[PDB]
Design a binder for this molecule. Structure first.
Ligand SMILES: Nc1nc2c(ncn2[C@@H]2O[C@H](COP(=O)(O)OP(=O)(O)NP(=O)(O)O)[C@@H](O)[C@H]2O)c(=O)[nH]1
Ligand SMILES: CCCNS(=O)(=O)c1ccc(F)cc1C
Ligand SMILES: [Mg+2]
Ligand code: NA
Lengths: 167, 469, 166
């Protein structure tokens, strides 16, 4: 039947990464979540008129299990590489996440998008021009998202699906 | 009729329930949201006890009430005014007779004594199971000691004297079994010869047993204080979650050690023996319900340096590939089969902690702290109940001890394992991957040959236990 | 996984808490800290079926005697515990039996009679007297020691079997 896309969210812990998938999968309009629920990470969507199923792996909270990253990553067809716009270290981590994805998938051209996440009102330290320049150097899209208003969230995931479709 | 209550002007916990102060979920009621006053009222309710709620509340309350304020509120709850004499009592006293005091006696028996006892039960659970609040705030402990030590009257006396002693014991602070543990097993390395201990020289059964004891102890040491508030992900994680981090770092180090043992064995035949031995260890982990250990092996076999070693896995016996495949299937589809297996086995077991961490974090990030109703902000207690359901599951598997004997030297060997040495993580994992490329080059580069490195027999003793008299 | 709600009742000091903690943690508690109300959970395979035991550990001190209906309503089976060196605790058993029957409005509540502290030589309640009482109730009698673990699994898992067959 319909295509299923296995998407994997990667990025530094402690800076609101989990809000991206929660806001997507959520009852968009009721701020509530039970992650233990069978298929709290599967969502049927219509992208450019084509219905598909998103299966999203977000291991947020398990960042210290660093030797499990390879196995988790290999499950994915496309990757959201997420940093927080008020945490420069999480932005500097992006290069190594991308290198690890390329190694695990054994490909120099893996569908991925760079996501800059605004997780609170603390001052931004990564300007959008810096992140656009990084994404352009990698040949991938850049999407900014809000962890509170849901802005950018659909764009991040739909853009990644388009990268998979056009691979 | 129901008992009359003190005026809400003199005793705040007698205010009537309303949607402005408490909301229930759709046979005791389950609270969705409420003011802190209403939560404490129901925590210590005169009509029923709610031990689950006591645990849930004491595990999670610091997200909405400070410890000092909680103590003030339960002391306020405890201090219940008694009703005045009724008209019948008045008339008796006016005639020089003793009043029956029926309403007063009922209120003492059915309201004051149950509420006061349930306040003391909160204090008892607080001191016994959440003592870190008092370790971190000596003045809070003084206030609790003073409160308990000045409760008067004989109805509460046994529990007041008991709680006083429990507090004093907690300030300065053994297993029995249905059978004997099995005999410790030895292979090439003999007892006391710690300098020869290694992956292939220790007995694979005993490697799995001693790692299971170690990993069980690490699992059992993690307290809910290290989890609530997602504190293991925050800047002070080393202060707030040290036992959790020690547990995860052990798991990571063992996984990396397995990878290092594999890729530093350059001879193909020897490396097949190494991989085969690690799968045997995985088989014993499965028999012991050590799921952390199972996934340590699975993570190593699916790491980038090991996963690509097609020439090595080609020589692994089919039965061992099947064992590894069925272990890997536990993690597939968001751990569907793992979760079902964990809920089916007979403990003791060692759960994989990572799923709990993700579920606690997402529950706390995905639900609001408060619900706004009728212009009021109510504490969203359903969110805290969901977190405490997870910490309760963790605790349930922390109770059962393994009936296995510690071998102090093997224990020390695995405690001191340090595969990365002084190297940083990226440097080390690049080293492992470059070794993988050296020992099995990318096609179309030819497969080289390498000399043997082990001088002792590679044949496994197997993983079925032996039993001399 | 079927869930079973077990309640442990009996006079103060007979070893209800020690029995429960021995079952849950394989540890014997030497202290006598009177219980108000405690609850424990245990996943265990019994007769090949996995279940989840919810165990309510109740207060035996007489000062809490007016607070029992609320836990007897919730329980699905009751361990009725006395100590074999305490004749008064044995005489208290029938009061718990009758209250459980009244609250649950039933003559057929899953129960097990437990004579605890069987590690002690100085017995004052003979096994025959307790067995006679158990037969009059239609329930098994199991002697236990929270100290040595004798009979402990048998007492709790027999109660589970009686809830299962109810
Ligand atoms: N020798 C021996 N002592 C026991 C046994 N079970 C309990 N005790 C002891 O008896 C005392 C009371 O035990 P405890 O479990 O607190 O009794 P309880 O019935 O729960 N008391 P309460 O109703 O007040 O909560 C403790 O000192 C305990 O060590 C047993 O099987 N053998
Ligand atoms: C496609 C997933 C393979 N992961 S596995 O089941 O652990 C496995 C199984 C057999 C094998 F020879 C090597 C590995 C690594
Ligand atoms: Mg007790
Ligand atoms: Na920064």
């Amino acid at each position: 039947g319909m295509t299923e896309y296995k998407l994997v969210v990667v990025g530094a812990g402690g800076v609101g990464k989990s809000a991206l998938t929660i806001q997507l999968i959520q009852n968009h309009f009721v701020d509530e979540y039970d992650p233990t629920i069978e298929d709290s990470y599967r969502k049927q969507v219509v992208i450019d008129g084509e219905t598909c199923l998103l299966d999203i792996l977000d291991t947020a909270g398990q960042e210290e299990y660093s030797a499990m990253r390879d196995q988790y990553m290999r499950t994915g067809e496309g990757f959201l590489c997420v940093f927080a716009i008020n945490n420069t270290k999480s932005f500097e981590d992006i290069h190594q996440y991308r290198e690890q994805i390329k190694r695990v998938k054994d490909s120099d051209d893996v569908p991925m998008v760079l996501v800059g996440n605004k997780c609170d009102l603390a001052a931004r330290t990564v300007e959008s021009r810096q992140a656009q320049d990084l994404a352009r150097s990698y040949g991938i899209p850049y999407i900014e998202t809000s962890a509170k208003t849901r802005q950018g969230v659909e764009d991040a995931f739909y853009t990644l699906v388009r990268e998979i479709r056009q691979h | 009729g129901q008992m009359r209550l003190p005026s809400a002007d003199v005793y705040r916990f007698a205010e009537p329930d309303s949607e402005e102060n408490i909301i229930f979920e759709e046979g005791i009621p389950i609270i969705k949201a409420g003011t802190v006053i209403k939560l404490i009222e129901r925590l210590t309710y005169h009509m029923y006890a709610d031990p689950n709620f006591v645990r849930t509340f004491l595990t999670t309350y610091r997200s909405f009430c400070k410890p000092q304020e909680l103590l003030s509120l339960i002391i306020e709850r405890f201090e219940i005014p008694e009703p005045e004499p009724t008209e019948a009592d008045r008339i008796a006293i006016e005639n020089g007779d003793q009043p029956l005091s029926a309403e007063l006696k009922r209120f003492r028996k059915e309201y004051i004594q149950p509420v006061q006892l349930r306040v003391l039960n909160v204090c008892r659970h607080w001191v016994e199971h959440h003592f870190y609040d008092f370790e971190r705030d000596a003045y809070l402990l003084q206030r609790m000691e003073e409160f308990i030590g000045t409760v008067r009257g004989k109805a509460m006396k046994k529990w007041v004297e008991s709680i006083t002693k429990i507090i004093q014991r907690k300030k300065i602070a053994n297993i029995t079994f249905q059978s004997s543990p099995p005999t410790v097993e030895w292979h090439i390395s003999r007892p006391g010869h710690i300098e020869t201990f290694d992956l292939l020289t220790l007995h694979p059964i005993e490697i799995a047993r001693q790692l299971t004891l170690l990993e069980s102890d690490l699992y059992r040491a993690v307290q809910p204080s290290e989890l609530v508030g997602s504190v293991w992900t925050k800047e002070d994680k080393e202060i707030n979650s040290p036992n959790l981090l020690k547990m995860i770092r052990h798991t990571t180090n063992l996984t990396l050690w397995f990878e290092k043992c594999i890729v530093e064995t350059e001879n193909l035949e020897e490396r097949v023996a190494v991989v085969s031995r690690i799968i045997e260890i995985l088989q014993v982990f499965q028999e012991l319900n050590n799921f952390n250990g199972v996934l340590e092996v699975v993570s190593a076999m699916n790491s980038s340096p090991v996963y690509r070693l097609d020439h090595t896995f080609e020589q692994i016996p089919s039965r061992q590939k099947k064992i590894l495949e069925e272990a890997h299937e536990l993690s597939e589809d968001h751990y569907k089969k793992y979760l079902a297996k964990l809920r089916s086995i007979n403990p003791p077991c060692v759960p994989f902690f990572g799923i709990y961490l993700t579920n606690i974090l997402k529950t706390e990030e995905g639900n609001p702290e408060v619900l706004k109703r009728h212009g009021k902000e109510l504490i969203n207690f359903s969110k805290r109940r969901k977190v405490a359901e997870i910490t309760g599951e963790i605790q349930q598997y922390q109770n059962q001890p393994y009936c296995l004997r510690v071998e102090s030297d093997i224990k020390r060997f695995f405690e001191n394992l340090n595969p990365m040495g002084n190297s940083m993580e990226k440097e080390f994992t690049d080293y492992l991957f470059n070794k993988s490329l050296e020992i099995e080059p990318r096609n179309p580069k030819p497969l080289p040959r390498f000399p043997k490195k082990y001088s002792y027999p590679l044949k496994s003793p197997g993983v079925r236990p032996s039993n001399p008299r």
